[PDB]
Amino acid sequence: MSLKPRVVDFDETWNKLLTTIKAVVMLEYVERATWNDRFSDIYALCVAYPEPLGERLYTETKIFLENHVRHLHKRVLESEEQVLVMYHRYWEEYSKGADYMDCLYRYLNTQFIKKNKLLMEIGELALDMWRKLMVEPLQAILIRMLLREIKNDRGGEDPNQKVIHGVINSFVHVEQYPLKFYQEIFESPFLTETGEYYKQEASNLLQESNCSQYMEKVLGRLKDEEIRCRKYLHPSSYTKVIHECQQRMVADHLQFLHAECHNIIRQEKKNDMANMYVLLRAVSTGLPHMIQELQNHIHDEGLRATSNLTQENMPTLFVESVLEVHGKFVQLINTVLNGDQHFMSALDKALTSVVNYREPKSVCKAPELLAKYCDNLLKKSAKGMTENEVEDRLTSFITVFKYIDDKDVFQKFYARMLAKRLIHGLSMSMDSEEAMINKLKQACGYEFTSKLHRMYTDMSVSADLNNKFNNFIKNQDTVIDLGISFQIYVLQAGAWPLTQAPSSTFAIPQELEKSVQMFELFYSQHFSGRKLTWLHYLCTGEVKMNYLGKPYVAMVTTYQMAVLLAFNNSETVSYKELQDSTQMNEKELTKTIKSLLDVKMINESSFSLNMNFSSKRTKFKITTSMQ
């Protein structure tokens, strides 16, 4: 049709509109005639001419809404023996009457507020009023029934999940037009009941069970409480209930928990430790006392274990103790309690206390011990390990010694020791030394090994510039002959220490003197690294004398060889003769003389050459003492 305008009759229109509202809301399916006539009547009422009829029609609708609220309230008040079920059913009936909300009253939704506004919301206000008429007076009964059902479920009976959920939902769902309704309706009483229950349960359990039993029962109860909160509430307050229970049970007993935690940690009851750590992790104050006790116990155990070290193998014992303690503590803590960075810091502090414990009456030589341990692990005379094992040991030692006090002292000791071990001809692998140095340089910084770099560049600069001069000689004019190979390192000369300043000018054998002089003559061209003093205390070699009982020359140092090259003048000499020929001081002269006399190399002091010198090995060396 194409319907022209019309004049409406208020009374008949209201009667017809009510006759459709009743058949729609009342859970009844009505004829298509009424279905189609409802909207037509509504429009005819809303289209009054030549004036408005809103005030009247809207007043009638509002009276209808108030009547619905009051009638629902009374019908529910008929619910004495079925309060909760009746409340749920009536709320569901109203919710279904609104769930038909895709039918008619969009005009009511959006043609009144924008007729006297920018006085409430219409459908939301209808829900709120229906709650006021029945819910607003019956809140006592509804809350009481909910609490009774919760208590009964806590006792062992089966509750009414769907009814509980809907009854809880509606009151918050009153106003759409956000946490006002629900967060002001249920959260408070729910949390209050949960807190009372948790307080009673914790008070009973604290005496009804031991620490581990209480912790396990509390974990199970917390899981059950989370399940119940999920079943009977939304995520807006589940955290509130859980936190209230946690404060009641795992919070109020923090002091007793820490009192037992000393023994718990000292007993390493993995399950109990995990339970305590979990219960205290979310708590502000749960960590500190346990962390302190654990750190103290670990440090004390490590120190006590290390006290029994055998004098022969001190570095090995220290390394083993540190590795064992660190491994056990890290494994336990990271397996039990989610890996607290506070636990990592406490482990670092305990390890530092263990390592930096220096006995009174002596200086703490831990860095020197570690450096010597690394040197021994890299040694070529102590078999039992592989190169990969050495690399792993260095990697472990870096993280172990991260907390050693004497960093600079350890560095200087290692530098001197490696300098000696390379001066002696024992560094079987500059690459293995460089792997240890790679650990030390990935850990100790760039300045940590700038000195090592200089010392290496010195072994080279000597190697490099001297080789250049030797090559220039190989391209030179005159002839040359060696008869004895040799090697040297004087380069950029400030990497490793040999720091004893000279005291007496050295007069060494012309044998090596010629090599030194030719080296200087070929070398003095175009380089500059170190320009330091003499670090040449390492002079020695051999010569084969076909004039003794047989040709036999054993290891002899530079002083002894120079004295014997003074023997290239006379075989019998007094002390003054050897002293002058060597240019050495009194202490070195006496030491060399005694060593040469007792070593079978010789036989108001006087000395003579040995013509019958012999030993158990035809190749034996007069030793240098400093070793």
Binding site: Y49, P50, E51, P52
Partner: protein
């Protein structure tokens, strides 16, 4: 509704298919917009403007707002990559409601507003429509909801 006085060139002319004459709103030092010359429906208008400027499209002979590039207004950008671009013109959700309000305002002069065979709701409530400062402020009211 106050344009940005960047002075950084934005080399673009917006292809505006407005069926009337194209004289959109503009920006002043404090924000004063003024009409512009005629750009008819289908063709574009070319002018160099200032970076940071926000402007939209309307009907030159209707005076009603049609969302700037369908949005609030074609927006301010600087000159990088040197390419042309524009915030073109287009209707809002093409409303028979606005069409009827403006049709009443057109078939009856602005002095013919409260004179239906009806009561005095049409003029204000529905045909209190096209205006430059109004359209601008109301689009800005949307953008204040935003």
């Amino acid at each position: 509704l106050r344009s940005v006085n960047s002075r950084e060139p934005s080399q673009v002319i917006f292809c505006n298919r407005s069926p009337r004459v194209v004289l959109p709103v503009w920006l002043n030092f404090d924000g004063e917009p003024q009409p512009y010359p005629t750009l008819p429906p289908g063709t574009g208008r070319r002018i160099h403007s200032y970076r940071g400027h926000l402007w939209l499209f309307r009907d030159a002979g209707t005076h009603d707002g049609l969302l700037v590039n369908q949005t609030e207004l074609f927006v301010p950008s600087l000159n990088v990559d040197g390419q042309p671009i524009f915030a073109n013109i287009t209707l809002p959700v093409y409303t028979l409601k606005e069409r009827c309000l403006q049709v009443v305002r057109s078939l009856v002069k602005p002095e013919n507003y409260r004179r239906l065979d009806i009561v005095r709701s049409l003029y204000e409530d529905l045909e209190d429509h096209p205006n430059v400062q109004k359209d601008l402020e109301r689009l800005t009211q949307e953008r204040i909801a935003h």
